[PDB]
Structure formats: C-alpha cells, structure tokens
Amino acid sequence: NQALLRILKETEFKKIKVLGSGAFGTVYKGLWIPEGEKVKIPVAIKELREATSPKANKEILDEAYVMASVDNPHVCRLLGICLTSTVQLIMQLMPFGCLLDYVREHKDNIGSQYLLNWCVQIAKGMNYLEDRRLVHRDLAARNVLVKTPQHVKITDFGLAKLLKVPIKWMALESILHRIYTHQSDVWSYGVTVWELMTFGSKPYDGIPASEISSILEKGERLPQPPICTIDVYMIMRKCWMIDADSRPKFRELIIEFSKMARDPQRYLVIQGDERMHLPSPTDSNFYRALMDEEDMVVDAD
Amino acid sequence: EAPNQALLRILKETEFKKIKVLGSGAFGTVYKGLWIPEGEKVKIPVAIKELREATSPKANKEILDEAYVMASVDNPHVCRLLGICLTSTVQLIMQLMPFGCLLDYVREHKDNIGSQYLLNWCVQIAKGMNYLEDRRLVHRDLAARNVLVKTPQHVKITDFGLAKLLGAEEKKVPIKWMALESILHRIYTHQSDVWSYGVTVWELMTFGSKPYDGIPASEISSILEKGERLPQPPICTIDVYMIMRKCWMIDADSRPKFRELIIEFSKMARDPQRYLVIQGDERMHLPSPTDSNFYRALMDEEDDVVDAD
Ligand SMILES: CN1CCN(c2ccc(Nc3ncc4nc(Nc5ccccc5)n(C5CCCCC5)c4n3)cc2)CC1
Ligand SMILES: CN1CCN(c2ccc(Nc3ncc4nc(Nc5ccccc5)n(C5CCCCC5)c4n3)cc2)CC1
C-alpha cells in the first residue's frame, strides 16, 4: 500500500541536530514543516551513508513501501522518504532514545519487571515480522527504541537489505554463509536479551570479530548474566544453538517471558529490586497522554 | 472511584518548569512547559495554565474534586486534564498543541479554508459538547478561542469547568457568547451551551470576525431582547444560518440539542458545496490518504471525518 509511504521534497523539512550514527548512516533530529503552515514538527531523520553498490531507485522505493507497511506496536514504521542525491528516511522522534543507551544510564536502578517486559515486547515485534515473512537481519539493543519506559519498539527494519557487519550479534551460519532467516534473527534476539540483562555490556568484549566464528565453533557462548536465573539464561543459550531449527520460535519466547513477568523477582535477582519502581496507573496514564497515544503489559501476580 | 484517582496526576514544582507564555485569558496565563519524569533526563513539552486567583476561593479539597472531574472527561474532542500542581498557585497541566487555537487558525488561514473543514469542525465541536451533556457537565464558556487544533482535521474543546472553578465577580466575561438567561440571571445549562455553540459556529464561518463588533457589552441584553442577532455570513446558505438562528432563540427548550446538531451538521458535510459557498472550494479539499496517514503518525495517534458523497 503506497498510501502508507509519503515522499517529501527537501524544502518541507530541516535537520537541526545530530543524534547519533551507525554503519548505515547518520541520524538527525529534524523538523517537518507542513506546507502553508507555521508549525515545526520534530522527526528523526536518517541520511543514508552513500551507497556503495547503489541500487536502482525503483528498488529503493519498493523496499520503502514494505518498510512503510509495518504495522505493529513494537516495530517502528517508516513514515516518509526523501530521495535526491541522497536517501533520507523519516520516522517518529523518540525522546527517550535507544534502549541500549537507556539501560546503561539506569544501570543498576532498573527493576526486574521492566527488563522482562522489554524482552516480551521485542519478541512480540519480531513475531510480527515473522508472520509477515520479513527478516530484520540486524536486531540489536541499539536498534530498539524507547517510546516510554513501558513501551519499546524495534527500529531499522529493512535497512540491512537496503544497503561494519555486526559479527558479535550474528548467527554462525550468517557469519559463514551470509544466510539470514527468522532463526538467525532469533540468534540476534538472544544477544539483544543478553545486552539488556548486563545493562548494556558489550558482547564478547576484548575478543576481536575475526576470532568470533572460531569461538562459537568451540562452543563458547556469552556468560550467564549476574542478575539472571538459570531459567532466563537457558532461553538465551537456546537462541544460540548451532542447529537453527533447534532455536526457539518467537511465539514461544513471548509466552516464556510473559510467564516470568508474572513473577519477575523469581526470575531476576537484582539488588534493591524491592526499592525499584514499576509504573503506577496514575503514572501510566500521564505517560500515555503526553507521549504514547497508540494502541498497546504483564504485571506481577 | 479508583479509576478517577488514577486519571489526575499530582505534580510537584520540582517535576515541571514553565518556559514560555503561549497566551493569556480571563482564567489565567498559559505556558509551554516541560515535564521531567523523576529519575529521567528527558524533558517533555506540556501546556501549563496558571490560574488567576479565584473569585472568592475554595479549599484545595474543593479544588481537587473539581479537578478530578476535569481529569475525568474521555472523548476525542474534549481536552482532558492530565495533572495539577496546587502547592502555591494552582497550575493545570495538559497536552500541548502546536497548531494552537482554532480562532487564530481561521484568522491565519481565512483565504485558504474549505467547506469540508468548516462543517467537520462544527460536527466535532458538537460531538464534544454532547459528550459533556451526557456527563451532566456544562462548559459555560464555549468559544472559538476555547477550541484547540490537534491537527487541521481534528479539533478539541478546552477549558471545561474553569468557569465554575474560577467563578466571576458580578462587577472578561464572555457576554457576547452568552445566552440571555445567563446574562440576566446567570442561568447556565446545556441549552445555554447550545447558544454559545451558535456563536462559535458564527466565529468560524466569518473566519474569526468578532461578534457584535461596535456594540457595547453592556448593551447586549437589550439588543437581544429586541430580537437582534448576528448577521448571516456571506459564505453561509440559509439552511446554515437558520440553524445558527435556532441556537439563539430566547426560549431555551426551543433551541436545538447537541445530538440534533451533530446529525444535521454531519448531513451537511456529505454535501459541503451545497451548504456553503466558497470561492476556490474545489481547490480546498480534505487531505489525501497519504497526507492523512503521515499526519496521524506524527501528531495524531489517538482514536473520523465525514467526506463528500
Ligand atoms: C546524548 N543523547 C544521545 C541520544 N539522544 C537521543 C537519541 C535518539 C532519540 N530519539 C530517536 N528517535 C527516533 C530515532 N530513530 C532512530 N533511528 C532511525 C533509524 C532509521 C530511520 C530513522 C531513525 N534513532 C536513532 C537510534 C540510534 C541512536 C541514534 C538515533 C532515533 N532516535 C532521542 C534522544 C539524546 C542525546
Ligand atoms: C503568538 N502565538 C502564541 C501562541 N501560540 C500557540 C499557543 C498554544 C498552542 N498550543 C496550545 N496547546 C495547548 C493549549 N492549552 C491551552 N489552554 C489551556 C487551558 C487550560 C489548561 C491547559 C491549557 N492553550 C491555549 C489556547 C488559547 C491561547 C493560549 C493557549 C493551548 N495552546 C500553540 C500555539 C502560537 C504563537
């Protein structure tokens, strides 16, 4: 459905500051000016890194439409595109920024309930892509966005297809043969979950990328996170099985994490966890009106 | 109820900072403000209205019960009160709308506004008021100034319950928007809200013309008593003007009910050209599906519009 993607002229928006960057490109906080209107509306703009092996414009657009069609509460939807000399992608700007940064910032101060819920939400997002026969190919903590602390969405879907390689998040078959599948995504999902539990620790730190395929073949895997019970780590371990069909399906993951969300304290052992706050209804209603109006969580009991 | 307790957020002064004044009103002064959630680095833009001291005042608990009622409203076309800070000055916190009030917008865009927009705005405002009437609530101050634009396609009534909470001295009062019974005896009812709706529709059709310009506020009851009314706008057909005329009938029960208005204005929207005459109207048309989709994603994720047959 083309109605979903809006092509924009350069004049109708401006980049005002840099938010970050990736292997893919640079991201800017931008302002959209509706023509004939006096408002400026904040957006996030990614200007694509320039185009080694440039693809036909029609191909870019077809990929954009698919990108534009994503309709789930936990997957970011591509809103607009401006293509000139350069390709620029427009999406909603999220004040909280990315999940990897958010966990680092609140490093030991995050409650077990938030963490398990995030795992559920990402899995729900991934499940949606699988239903649609779509492979993200680059799931990572940096590519999850915080709409509100209680709501997160996967971003950057389609980009990897659109254009270094993230070896440390990759499935062994993908590293070896460039094979990408939902199951490979499952592998990345496990790594992403490992990032959350360790509060944004870098995976395989101190081990170079070239060594990584070799460590994996040996049977080495990321270590059990300090807050994680065996019940959680095992799911991660399963995600990293060599035989891909052996790895869990995204649907199963939603259930396991949801069950855990019901009794977070049993699953995650975090210092001061009792002290930590999981969001009140009054607080939740305030958050929704201000930031998160859209349709969309598991609580202890 | 518990549900009520949840809807209104008690705010500390530490929680928010006022940054800029968006305007001033009889009720108070309005600022674009930033909310900082505890333990967070983000600042969230919000609208804070800081209340002018009430005509003879009420206890905070009294203030609070009324605030719970305001936080209570849950309709697409009525602004809901998100939060309150009562520590010193009374401050009301609500969602910030970039487009601003509808009255300024029509004034700004008078050359560029289509029939489809105008009729739809009437449907939406009537819908919101009908919702308040169902809740057994009287706004008491309807005016174009008190309607906010979420997006050009979507509008919301604001400032509900302020009049009652604030009061007014007998000795700033929206006389020209008021029903005669309200002016003379200070009777306020849904039927009086209906009269205001008539004036608000007038404000829109004339594109922000002041009502009764050149007539003193003091003279207003008399001119009305004589059967004087606001003139028919050039754009408006007789069928529209008559509806406005019904709204200003002296007998309250004779006046239209909001549900009736919703239906009638809704019918009109289906054939917009028939009911209003605007030069270049075919150029001025509702946003296409692509623009509509974009707009909603950026600004309007909540919750229709009636389009031509
Ligand atoms: C020192 N900090 C740095 C982080 N920061 C911040 C960063 C991002 C946001 N919000 C936001 N919103 C939407 C985004 N969409 C993409 N990504 C993206 C991908 C494809 C198309 C459009 C955007 N991003 C990226 C996510 C990775 C890190 C850079 C911003 C986005 N980021 C709010 C605050 C505030 C200052
Ligand atoms: C020279 N002008 C200055 C004004 N301006 C502007 C002002 C407000 C907004 N948006 C916005 N949003 C929420 C509002 N909530 C109340 N009012 C309000 C009342 C009670 C509780 C909370 C808000 N307002 C009033 C609407 C009438 C004029 C003063 C701002 C609001 N207005 C957008 C643009 C554009 C440039």
XYZ file of C-alpha atoms and ligand atoms in Angstrom:
682
model
C 0.000 0.000 0.000
C 1.586 3.213 -1.291
C -0.735 5.337 0.814
C 1.465 4.340 3.765
C 4.636 5.941 2.447
C 4.949 9.658 1.908
C 7.565 11.111 -0.390
C 8.797 14.514 0.692
C 10.527 17.409 -1.002
C 13.674 18.710 0.694
C 12.138 22.121 1.324
C 9.486 20.818 3.683
C 11.956 19.703 6.356
C 15.235 20.708 8.073
C 17.919 18.891 10.052
C 18.718 20.691 13.262
C 20.983 18.419 15.294
C 22.819 15.076 15.253
C 21.502 12.297 17.478
C 23.834 9.507 16.503
C 25.224 7.353 13.768
C 25.510 3.825 12.514
C 27.104 1.608 9.948
C 24.104 2.592 7.881
C 24.193 6.384 8.226
C 23.739 9.484 10.333
C 20.618 10.231 12.339
C 19.358 13.775 12.841
C 16.681 15.325 14.904
C 14.741 17.137 12.199
C 11.770 19.455 11.846
C 8.861 18.959 9.471
C 7.056 21.997 8.178
C 3.719 21.287 6.640
C 3.464 23.434 3.539
C 1.488 26.573 4.098
C 1.649 26.046 7.845
C 3.519 27.710 10.644
C 4.325 24.642 12.755
C 7.594 22.807 13.008
C 7.205 19.132 13.905
C 10.051 17.063 15.324
C 11.058 13.929 13.463
C 14.022 11.601 13.251
C 15.917 11.628 10.010
C 18.426 9.159 8.778
C 20.603 10.178 5.965
C 21.967 7.135 4.283
C 25.651 6.574 4.034
C 26.478 6.912 0.403
C 25.666 3.949 -1.497
C 28.462 1.541 -2.295
C 26.744 -0.803 -4.773
C 23.977 1.680 -5.375
C 20.614 0.101 -6.136
C 18.019 1.304 -8.584
C 15.688 3.987 -7.312
C 12.653 1.868 -8.020
C 14.139 -0.876 -5.863
C 14.754 1.535 -3.027
C 11.152 2.665 -3.183
C 9.787 -0.860 -3.257
C 11.792 -1.592 -0.123
C 10.489 1.654 1.362
C 6.903 0.619 0.794
C 7.476 -2.619 2.614
C 9.127 -0.598 5.334
C 6.169 1.766 5.294
C 3.763 -1.164 5.742
C 4.980 -2.353 9.098
C 2.048 -2.093 11.461
C 2.766 -3.307 14.972
C 3.092 -1.529 18.322
C 6.599 -2.853 18.777
C 8.030 -2.228 15.359
C 8.880 1.262 14.167
C 7.169 2.196 10.943
C 8.913 4.144 8.221
C 6.883 7.254 7.614
C 8.469 9.202 4.848
C 11.226 9.217 2.348
C 13.141 11.912 0.577
C 15.408 10.746 -2.218
C 17.680 13.055 -4.129
C 21.423 12.715 -4.445
C 20.890 11.145 -1.056
C 18.346 8.874 0.584
C 16.717 10.227 3.721
C 14.307 8.301 5.890
C 11.776 9.931 8.199
C 10.369 8.307 11.318
C 8.897 9.468 14.603
C 11.366 11.022 17.039
C 11.537 9.352 20.427
C 12.621 11.486 23.328
C 13.987 8.554 25.357
C 16.260 7.430 22.541
C 17.580 3.918 22.211
C 17.215 1.069 24.686
C 20.876 0.223 24.842
C 21.660 3.729 25.990
C 18.741 3.776 28.402
C 19.813 0.646 30.289
C 23.375 1.878 30.615
C 22.143 5.155 32.004
C 19.961 3.477 34.576
C 22.466 0.725 35.024
C 21.601 -0.941 38.305
C 18.482 1.045 39.011
C 16.115 -0.770 36.675
C 13.525 -3.125 38.067
C 13.147 -6.737 37.050
C 9.678 -6.003 35.753
C 10.912 -3.521 33.180
C 13.526 -5.916 31.861
C 11.317 -8.950 31.334
C 8.627 -6.805 29.773
C 11.083 -5.436 27.260
C 12.006 -8.984 26.292
C 8.361 -9.729 25.730
C 7.843 -6.624 23.638
C 10.794 -7.225 21.322
C 9.743 -10.808 20.881
C 6.249 -9.625 20.035
C 7.748 -7.270 17.490
C 9.881 -9.972 15.966
C 6.940 -12.337 15.886
C 5.092 -9.791 13.825
C 7.889 -9.675 11.268
C 7.976 -13.454 11.092
C 4.230 -13.575 10.485
C 4.876 -11.302 7.523
C 7.828 -13.318 6.174
C 10.147 -10.420 6.907
C 13.669 -10.813 8.286
C 15.110 -7.836 10.168
C 18.690 -9.087 9.832
C 20.109 -6.595 12.348
C 18.339 -6.904 15.693
C 20.351 -5.356 18.499
C 19.884 -3.187 21.574
C 20.926 -0.084 19.624
C 18.056 -0.803 17.252
C 15.402 -0.841 19.920
C 13.790 2.481 20.776
C 12.135 3.663 23.958
C 8.770 5.302 23.310
C 8.241 5.268 27.048
C 9.983 3.168 29.658
C 6.973 0.861 29.496
C 6.860 0.746 25.695
C 9.671 -0.149 23.255
C 9.865 -0.632 19.501
C 12.303 -2.267 17.171
C 13.737 0.072 14.624
C 15.845 -0.099 11.492
C 13.967 -2.902 9.793
C 14.807 -3.206 6.131
C 17.991 -1.200 6.287
C 20.375 -4.129 6.016
C 18.681 -5.192 2.838
C 18.711 -1.574 1.668
C 22.490 -1.320 1.751
C 30.667 -2.828 9.503
C 28.850 -6.148 9.677
C 27.790 -6.822 13.273
C 29.582 -10.124 13.778
C 29.095 -10.224 17.540
C 25.292 -10.240 17.211
C 25.305 -12.642 14.259
C 24.277 -16.281 13.918
C 27.104 -18.613 12.966
C 25.512 -19.586 9.669
C 25.121 -15.915 8.770
C 28.767 -15.217 9.571
C 29.876 -18.174 7.471
C 27.450 -18.137 4.514
C 25.540 -14.861 4.789
C 22.372 -16.796 5.462
C 19.600 -14.736 7.033
C 16.424 -16.199 8.443
C 13.956 -15.774 11.257
C 16.039 -18.240 13.229
C 19.146 -16.148 12.640
C 17.078 -13.282 13.963
C 16.395 -15.484 16.930
C 20.128 -15.676 17.422
C 20.400 -11.897 17.420
C 17.435 -11.728 19.756
C 19.322 -13.748 22.321
C 22.285 -11.458 22.078
C 19.972 -8.487 22.464
C 18.452 -10.041 25.559
C 21.969 -10.580 26.884
C 22.667 -6.884 26.374
C 19.649 -5.909 28.452
C 20.449 -8.202 31.360
C 24.018 -6.979 31.571
C 22.826 -3.392 31.497
C 24.419 -2.642 28.164
C 27.637 -4.570 28.393
C 29.364 -5.065 25.066
C 29.201 -8.652 23.839
C 32.378 -10.684 23.653
C 34.359 -7.718 24.902
C 38.049 -7.987 24.246
C 37.595 -10.560 21.567
C 38.079 -9.423 18.020
C 35.455 -10.087 15.377
C 37.658 -12.399 13.325
C 38.015 -14.728 16.300
C 34.272 -14.901 16.865
C 33.297 -17.615 14.417
C 36.091 -19.671 15.882
C 34.963 -19.264 19.499
C 31.437 -20.251 18.529
C 32.508 -23.432 16.806
C 34.374 -24.344 20.004
C 31.156 -23.977 21.972
C 31.921 -20.734 23.707
C 28.944 -18.519 24.449
C 28.231 -15.340 26.328
C 28.317 -15.824 30.082
C 25.338 -16.047 32.415
C 24.390 -12.533 33.406
C 24.790 -11.690 37.055
C 21.114 -10.968 37.591
C 19.869 -13.900 35.543
C 18.499 -17.126 36.909
C 19.136 -20.318 35.056
C 15.613 -20.145 33.717
C 16.396 -16.961 31.813
C 19.912 -17.881 30.652
C 18.720 -21.142 29.167
C 16.466 -19.295 26.742
C 19.469 -17.272 25.685
C 21.529 -20.411 25.334
C 18.880 -21.970 23.144
C 18.832 -18.937 20.872
C 22.480 -19.651 20.178
C 22.179 -23.312 19.202
C 24.141 -24.265 16.063
C 21.229 -26.073 14.522
C 18.919 -23.185 13.773
C 15.691 -25.157 13.767
C 16.702 -26.067 17.297
C 16.451 -22.415 18.424
C 13.160 -21.226 19.908
C 10.404 -19.633 17.862
C 9.442 -16.060 18.633
C 5.939 -17.100 19.696
C 7.316 -19.418 22.401
C 9.509 -16.610 23.678
C 6.595 -14.278 24.254
C 4.970 -16.892 26.446
C 8.039 -17.701 28.499
C 8.871 -14.102 29.117
C 5.274 -13.275 29.870
C 5.107 -16.065 32.429
C 8.239 -14.717 34.019
C 6.850 -11.201 34.032
C 4.183 -12.513 36.343
C 6.801 -13.323 38.953
C 9.758 -11.169 37.991
C 11.583 -11.491 41.299
C 11.841 -15.241 40.986
C 13.405 -14.891 37.514
C 15.750 -11.942 38.037
C 17.698 -11.325 41.159
C 18.559 -7.660 41.317
C 19.911 -5.732 44.287
C 17.456 -3.159 45.612
C 14.734 -4.555 43.362
C 12.113 -4.103 46.037
C 13.116 -0.450 46.187
C 12.850 -0.025 42.400
C 9.611 1.232 40.947
C 7.370 -0.331 38.339
C 4.946 2.178 36.928
C 1.695 3.154 38.620
C -1.609 3.514 36.804
C -1.632 7.226 37.574
C 1.879 7.472 36.248
C 0.995 5.263 33.273
C -1.967 7.392 32.300
C 0.178 10.526 32.443
C 2.756 8.923 30.200
C 0.224 7.828 27.658
C -1.466 11.191 27.209
C 1.763 13.029 26.812
C 3.791 10.534 24.761
C 2.148 7.287 23.787
C -1.406 7.527 22.491
C -1.148 4.400 20.301
C -2.773 1.022 20.950
C -0.664 -1.388 23.029
C 1.806 -5.259 29.653
C 2.493 -8.008 32.182
C 2.485 -7.366 35.928
C 3.344 -9.444 38.989
C 0.555 -11.573 40.423
C -13.663 5.778 42.027
C -10.237 4.188 41.740
C -10.411 4.934 38.045
C -10.892 8.604 38.932
C -7.937 8.645 41.310
C -5.692 7.329 38.550
C -6.613 9.995 35.999
C -5.228 13.052 37.747
C -1.544 13.403 38.462
C -0.393 15.363 41.456
C 2.655 17.335 40.461
C 5.482 18.812 42.469
C 7.089 22.069 41.366
C 10.300 20.145 41.048
C 8.641 17.987 38.403
C 7.992 20.797 35.906
C 9.358 24.098 34.651
C 7.497 26.854 32.803
C 9.468 28.031 29.794
C 7.344 30.306 27.620
C 3.956 32.056 27.715
C 1.594 30.995 24.947
C -1.064 33.498 25.837
C -3.358 34.932 28.451
C -7.013 34.729 29.199
C -9.648 35.627 31.687
C -8.927 32.415 33.556
C -5.164 32.726 33.617
C -1.853 32.551 31.859
C -0.715 29.692 29.686
C 2.804 28.458 29.244
C 4.566 25.899 27.180
C 6.145 23.834 29.906
C 8.433 20.883 30.228
C 7.667 17.833 32.334
C 10.605 15.961 33.762
C 9.830 12.472 34.923
C 11.563 11.562 38.156
C 14.855 9.857 37.535
C 14.877 10.803 33.877
C 16.784 13.123 31.609
C 14.076 13.847 29.055
C 12.013 16.988 29.131
C 8.506 16.673 27.833
C 6.661 19.649 26.409
C 3.297 20.308 28.054
C 0.765 23.093 28.480
C 0.502 24.686 31.894
C -2.192 27.153 32.708
C -1.503 29.072 35.890
C -4.743 30.167 37.435
C -5.778 33.692 38.173
C -6.878 33.712 41.778
C -10.438 32.534 42.072
C -13.231 34.901 42.897
C -13.963 34.039 46.399
C -11.881 30.971 46.903
C -12.496 27.382 47.854
C -10.474 24.883 49.861
C -7.982 22.742 47.998
C -10.070 19.662 48.572
C -12.850 21.565 46.866
C -10.440 22.456 44.113
C -9.373 18.830 43.881
C -12.821 17.291 43.470
C -13.452 19.572 40.550
C -10.072 18.722 39.108
C -10.925 15.017 39.276
C -13.998 15.806 37.269
C -11.913 17.601 34.668
C -9.399 14.769 34.523
C -12.424 12.518 34.073
C -13.505 13.581 30.584
C -12.666 10.971 27.960
C -13.701 11.974 24.477
C -11.818 12.603 21.247
C -12.986 16.195 21.028
C -12.578 17.229 24.634
C -9.268 18.027 26.241
C -8.627 16.080 29.403
C -6.824 17.497 32.408
C -3.668 15.471 32.819
C -2.251 16.883 36.042
C -2.387 19.564 38.726
C 0.028 21.403 40.997
C -1.608 23.025 43.989
C 1.346 23.916 46.147
C 1.044 27.640 45.766
C -0.535 28.906 42.616
C -2.938 26.493 41.030
C -1.453 25.161 37.807
C -3.149 22.885 35.294
C -1.141 20.590 33.083
C -2.392 19.413 29.683
C -1.221 18.248 26.267
C 0.426 20.855 24.080
C -0.958 21.501 20.617
C 1.395 23.003 18.080
C -1.356 24.307 15.834
C -2.870 26.366 18.633
C -6.425 27.646 18.948
C -8.970 27.357 16.177
C -9.870 31.049 16.204
C -6.326 32.104 15.392
C -6.065 29.387 12.774
C -9.121 30.561 10.847
C -7.875 34.104 11.027
C -4.481 32.968 9.741
C -5.944 30.793 7.003
C -9.104 32.679 6.055
C -8.131 32.789 2.401
C -7.316 29.079 2.384
C -10.135 27.281 4.265
C -12.520 24.848 2.569
C -16.135 23.965 3.211
C -15.184 20.419 4.118
C -13.048 21.637 7.002
C -15.598 24.064 8.405
C -18.564 21.728 8.597
C -16.431 18.976 10.068
C -15.231 21.339 12.761
C -18.849 22.004 13.688
C -19.578 18.294 13.827
C -16.559 17.721 16.072
C -17.335 20.565 18.472
C -20.963 19.446 18.743
C -19.768 15.943 19.424
C -17.585 17.091 22.271
C -20.323 19.169 23.829
C -22.791 16.322 23.521
C -20.327 14.225 25.434
C -20.179 16.853 28.208
C -24.005 16.958 28.331
C -24.048 13.178 28.742
C -21.669 13.626 31.631
C -24.113 16.174 33.093
C -21.459 18.867 32.766
C -21.871 22.428 31.477
C -18.807 24.036 29.899
C -20.150 27.555 30.474
C -17.566 29.215 28.209
C -17.674 27.809 24.676
C -15.894 29.958 22.092
C -13.605 29.551 19.092
C -10.828 30.712 21.354
C -11.530 27.747 23.620
C -11.229 25.191 20.830
C -7.746 23.811 20.115
C -6.423 22.338 16.856
C -4.708 18.971 17.314
C -4.351 18.844 13.554
C -6.352 20.668 10.921
C -8.529 17.578 10.540
C -9.077 17.139 14.276
C -10.223 19.664 16.879
C -10.780 19.637 20.627
C -12.748 21.697 23.118
C -10.770 23.088 26.024
C -11.134 24.914 29.317
C -14.056 22.923 30.549
C -15.050 23.603 34.132
C -12.759 26.555 34.560
C -15.620 28.983 34.743
C -17.224 27.164 37.594
C -13.978 26.553 39.395
C -12.775 30.125 38.994
C -16.052 31.986 39.414
C -16.622 35.525 38.248
C -17.377 38.712 40.149
C -20.662 40.424 39.362
C -18.809 43.652 38.724
C -13.559 39.355 30.825
C -16.959 37.709 30.941
C -17.874 36.382 27.534
C -21.096 38.380 27.372
C -21.329 38.217 23.594
C -21.101 34.434 23.615
C -23.662 34.096 26.359
C -27.305 33.124 26.425
C -29.700 35.819 27.582
C -30.777 33.811 30.590
C -27.120 33.522 31.541
C -26.546 37.253 31.251
C -29.640 38.301 33.135
C -29.964 35.615 35.788
C -26.708 33.746 35.430
C -28.501 30.583 34.408
C -26.111 28.122 32.808
C -27.329 24.933 31.155
C -26.599 22.631 28.267
C -29.160 24.724 26.451
C -27.086 27.792 27.213
C -24.038 25.857 25.961
C -26.053 25.485 22.770
C -26.309 29.251 22.382
C -22.564 29.555 22.699
C -22.156 26.871 20.080
C -24.172 29.048 17.764
C -21.811 31.960 18.322
C -18.794 29.632 17.891
C -20.103 28.405 14.567
C -20.518 32.054 13.610
C -16.959 32.756 14.569
C -15.825 30.061 12.180
C -17.966 30.911 9.183
C -16.893 34.554 9.266
C -13.305 33.388 9.731
C -12.710 34.951 13.089
C -14.847 38.026 12.911
C -15.611 39.451 16.311
C -19.246 39.009 17.342
C -21.232 42.206 17.789
C -18.279 44.454 16.994
C -19.150 48.036 17.793
C -21.807 47.097 20.295
C -21.009 47.544 23.958
C -21.085 44.539 26.169
C -23.471 46.476 28.351
C -25.969 46.975 25.531
C -26.116 43.292 24.662
C -29.107 42.118 26.657
C -31.241 44.906 25.211
C -30.346 44.341 21.609
C -31.063 40.680 22.107
C -34.322 41.446 23.882
C -35.337 43.272 20.726
C -34.611 40.256 18.605
C -31.294 41.471 17.259
C -28.985 38.660 16.151
C -25.646 38.094 14.481
C -25.757 38.682 10.724
C -25.643 35.925 8.180
C -22.109 35.226 6.976
C -21.546 35.685 3.246
C -20.425 32.090 2.748
C -23.366 30.568 4.616
C -26.534 29.348 2.982
C -29.866 29.958 4.605
C -30.064 26.391 5.867
C -26.904 27.011 7.908
C -27.937 30.481 9.058
C -31.289 29.182 10.296
C -29.533 26.630 12.440
C -27.477 29.431 13.953
C -30.731 31.333 14.463
C -32.284 28.393 16.319
C -29.338 28.372 18.699
C -30.096 31.977 19.686
C -33.796 31.509 20.425
C -34.971 33.125 23.624
C -36.766 30.016 24.874
C -34.098 27.514 25.876
C -36.138 24.406 25.187
C -36.857 25.611 21.644
C -33.112 25.632 20.966
C -31.549 22.607 19.284
C -29.943 19.826 21.241
C -26.385 18.873 20.544
C -27.192 15.405 19.207
C -29.509 17.050 16.733
C -26.691 19.342 15.655
C -24.297 16.502 15.189
C -26.730 14.871 12.864
C -27.539 17.944 10.874
C -24.026 19.242 10.502
C -22.993 15.705 9.751
C -25.525 15.528 6.930
C -24.242 18.806 5.519
C -20.663 17.606 5.436
C -21.719 14.918 2.961
C -22.609 17.662 0.504
C -20.407 20.560 1.551
C -20.740 22.734 -1.541
C -24.489 22.746 -1.244
C -24.389 24.255 2.222
C -21.587 26.806 1.959
C -20.298 28.890 -0.901
C -16.569 29.389 -1.023
C -14.580 30.678 -3.962
C -11.952 28.175 -4.964
C -13.527 25.497 -2.794
C -12.666 22.607 -5.104
C -9.009 23.515 -4.633
C -9.536 23.393 -0.881
C -10.164 19.757 -0.114
C -9.536 17.243 2.589
C -6.097 15.719 2.922
C -5.350 12.739 0.784
C -4.891 9.337 2.351
C -1.103 9.633 2.240
C -1.046 13.015 3.966
C -3.637 11.881 6.419
C -1.588 8.832 7.292
C 1.546 10.900 7.793
C -0.185 13.474 9.933
C -1.654 10.947 12.237
C 1.651 9.206 12.735
C 3.439 12.430 13.673
C 0.745 14.207 15.661
C -2.479 12.271 15.974
C -2.264 8.679 17.121
C -5.491 8.834 19.089
C -8.845 7.464 18.026
C -13.468 10.195 11.911
C -14.121 12.901 9.376
C -17.157 12.957 7.124
C -16.274 13.175 3.449
C -18.393 14.218 0.466
C -20.681 11.851 -1.414
C 23.287 12.223 24.203
N 21.993 11.721 23.770
C 22.160 10.952 22.557
C 20.872 10.193 22.345
N 19.731 11.107 22.355
C 18.613 10.735 21.664
C 18.750 9.869 20.612
C 17.642 9.462 19.910
C 16.401 9.913 20.249
N 15.323 9.544 19.595
C 15.275 8.859 18.478
N 14.096 8.807 17.876
C 13.948 8.156 16.773
C 15.035 7.515 16.232
N 15.192 6.809 15.152
C 16.429 6.419 15.085
N 16.946 5.679 14.142
C 16.481 5.740 12.928
C 16.627 4.681 12.063
C 16.124 4.771 10.783
C 15.466 5.907 10.372
C 15.309 6.961 11.238
C 15.819 6.871 12.518
N 17.078 6.880 16.107
C 18.494 6.614 16.319
C 18.616 5.399 17.206
C 20.063 5.020 17.391
C 20.836 6.171 18.014
C 20.667 7.441 17.192
C 19.213 7.773 16.951
C 16.249 7.571 16.854
N 16.347 8.247 17.978
C 16.274 10.776 21.304
C 17.369 11.191 22.023
C 19.737 12.341 23.128
C 21.148 12.833 23.379
C 1.978 34.008 19.034
N 1.385 32.687 19.254
C 1.417 32.402 20.669
C 0.523 31.217 20.922
N 0.787 30.109 20.001
C 0.357 28.852 20.393
C -0.237 28.712 21.626
C -0.699 27.487 22.061
C -0.560 26.395 21.252
N -0.989 25.225 21.645
C -1.676 25.063 22.749
N -1.632 23.869 23.307
C -2.285 23.598 24.392
C -3.030 24.587 24.981
N -3.773 24.609 26.069
C -4.267 25.818 26.166
N -5.067 26.237 27.125
C -5.191 25.563 28.239
C -6.211 25.860 29.105
C -6.345 25.160 30.285
C -5.444 24.156 30.589
C -4.415 23.857 29.721
C -4.298 24.567 28.543
N -3.845 26.553 25.163
C -4.216 27.955 24.968
C -5.119 28.119 23.769
C -5.548 29.574 23.642
C -4.362 30.522 23.618
C -3.433 30.262 24.783
C -3.001 28.818 24.777
C -3.067 25.827 24.393
N -2.387 26.049 23.279
C 0.037 26.534 20.016
C 0.498 27.758 19.578
C 1.388 30.322 18.681
C 2.162 31.631 18.627
